[PDB]
């Protein structure tokens, strides 16, 4: 009975994506190190540049697709989700701008469960020195100026649709440039 947001993947119905959002985080540096050591589950994502959960679900769908084909661009599923958010194919740049660093105070954790792979959510939440919030609070954490900066969203793109739609178009087609 909780603040998590979960969705099944339509194309992979045995996979469920979970989103957890946190504010006032005080141990982001420890969290980043634990992710690199593999002692925290999920992708740690910078919510300041996340406009909508659909953006995450598109990135997650693609990551699972290439995971099962064995054709990921990055090393792990958790890095692949983060990489897929970026508008371009520079892996190091993507993981640094859409991942978390020690001077972040808001974190979005995204993980995927399927089959025997189960996440201990209570333990995960206990690792974050911060306050979990409902994803309803994402619009006050996302920074529209930073989003347009990272994505080079343009005036002609905004004239015909949402920022989200232009972002999704960039994400979904960057693998054929």
């Amino acid at each position: 009975p909780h603040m998590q947001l979960t969705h099944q993947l339509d194309l992979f119905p045995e996979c469920r994506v979970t989103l957890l959002l946190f504010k006032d985080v005080k141990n982001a540096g420890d969290l980043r190190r634990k992710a690199m050591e593999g002692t925290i589950d999920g992708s740690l994502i910078n919510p300041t540049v996340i406009v909508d959960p659909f953006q995450i679900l598109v990135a997650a769908n693609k990551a699972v697709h290439l995971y099962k084909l064995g054709k990921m661009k990055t090393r792990t599923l958790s890095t692949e989700i983060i990489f897929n958010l970026s508008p371009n194919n520079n892996i190091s740049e993507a993981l640094k701008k859409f991942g978390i660093s020690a001077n972040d105070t808001s974190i979005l954790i995204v993980y995927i469960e399927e089959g025997e792979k189960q996440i201990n959510q209570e333990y995960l939440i206990s690792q974050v020195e911060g306050h979990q919030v409902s994803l309803k609070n994402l619009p006050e954490i996302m920074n529209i100026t930073e989003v347009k900066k990272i994505y080079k969203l343009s005036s002609q793109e905004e004239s015909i649709g949402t920022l989200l739609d232009a972002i999704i178009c960039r994400m979904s087609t960057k693998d054929v440039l």
Partner: protein, 233 residues
Amino acid sequence: EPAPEAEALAAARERSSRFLSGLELVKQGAEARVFRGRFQGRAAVIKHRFPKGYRHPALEARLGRRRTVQEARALLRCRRAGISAPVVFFVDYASNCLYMEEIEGSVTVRDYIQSTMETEKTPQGLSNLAKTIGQVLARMHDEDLIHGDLTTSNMLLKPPLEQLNIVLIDFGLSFISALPEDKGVDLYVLEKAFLSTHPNTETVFEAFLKSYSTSSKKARPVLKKLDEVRLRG
């Protein structure tokens, strides 16, 4: 023993065929089928080319890949240029399936023109539609994007219908070219679609050409090529 990579690819193609199996068909082209479904909470269409039965499997895969890649590239070019066209959600190159936004409740320009002609018996009321199409295709060609299949069936009107919200679709035969001849052939396919599908709408096409010429600074050599390709049939 089978290769794990090949086994994984077969499982992905099975997933795709299974997902498409229970969906409603919204469009049937020569090669392509378009189904409507849901993608992560959004109304979506999914476009795929099924093997026709008389061709080599490798040739079918090459064809599906080529047109899927071209369409994904064109739709990105459209969005970044402010040309209205469906958002791409996901492109599955294992199965050559394109998942994109459904333009919900829309009607084709073809159907809209035919309904107008059967209610009003006059094409006089289609002048605004023609001017809008002229502006839209001028912008597309000024981005050097050749649609490749420009008929009144590949333009949608997004509701509310009388706002004339044109949305371009079906870029599987598109390519990039600055050559006036390629742009001229593009317009020629559209002219033939007006002439054979919408008889007695020459004023409509005339107003289209007028608006296209106004809207694109590069229209003059394109319209000269349109004259030439018509002759060299």
